Ligand binder design. Structure first.
Ligand code: XGP
Ligand code: ALF
Ligand code: MG
Ligand code: MG
Length: 218
């Protein structure tokens, strides 16, 4: 059987993308940059804070000092952290808590493979920390999806080969990252968006231990 499940955060466990959009758009507008729209933000799925900011600067060919860059990223992050202060166990997506319980009871390792450095805070707010055997640290493993690095790191963090792992993802870049790690992807979303070549479920209530085992056996 598969020996680990490697979880993306946003769009899988819960979704805080709206708050990232609001905060990046506010930052861009404060510094006179146009183009941070919903289409642009959908392209930031699985993308590090620093790569995200650079994409925004690139809209206007804006050059900033390293210190200015750090301050811009901090300003946006502070705003986003204020926006997520009310996240609680209520925000957990359907099926996810039961899946975590079932994986743990079956002695299957659980790791977070998110690009967001806010992962630990979010898991704590949602009362999920105790289910996670490890959290891959994007400050140590900074490559944005679709690079496989974060998933490889998550598997190493629980002592399981990626080839013996399942990855759960809601984004194109994240699915590719899982593929290139060697793990088996199961997407959540639409096949039009995420592919007709892998198993996709329409929402997270379909992520059950039984379903993961069915997919693994096929
Ligand atoms: O600022 P962190 O929370 O570290 O990173 C975030 O990660 C998000 C992906 O989960 C991405 O969409 C954001 O643009 C990025 O700021
Ligand atoms: F939390 Al993600 F790709 F949605 F790392
Ligand atoms: Mg995601
Ligand atoms: Mg989706």
């Amino acid at each position: 059987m598969f020996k680990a499940v490697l979880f993306d955060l946003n769009g899988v466990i819960t979704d805080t993308a709206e708050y990232h959009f609001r905060a990046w758009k506010a930052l861009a507008e404060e510094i006179g940059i146009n183009g941070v729209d919903r289409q642009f933000n959908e392209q930031l799925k699985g993308v590090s804070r620093e790569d995200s900011l650079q994409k925004i600067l690139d809209l206007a060919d804006k050059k900033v000092s390293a210190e200015e860059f750090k301050e811009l990223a901090k300003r946006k992050n502070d705003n986003y952290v204020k926006m997520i202060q009310d996240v609680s166990p209520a925000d957990v997506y359907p099926g996810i808590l039961q899946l975590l319980k079932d994986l743990r009871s079956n002695k299957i390792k659980i790791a977070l493979a998110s690009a967001s450095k806010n992962g630990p805070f979010l898991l704590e707010r949602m009362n999920l920390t105790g289910y996670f055997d490890a959290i891959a640290d994007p400050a140590e493993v900074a490559a944005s999806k679709p690079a496989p690095d974060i998933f490889i790191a998550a598997a190493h963090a629980v002592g399981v080969a990626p080839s013996e792992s399942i990855g759960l993802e809601d984004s194109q870049a994240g699915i590719q990252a899982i593929k290139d790690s060697g793990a088996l992807p199961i997407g959540v979303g639409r096949p039009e968006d995420l592919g007709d070549d892998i198993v996709i479920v329409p929402d997270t209530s379909h992520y059950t231990l039984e379903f993961l085992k069915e997919v693994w056996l096929q």
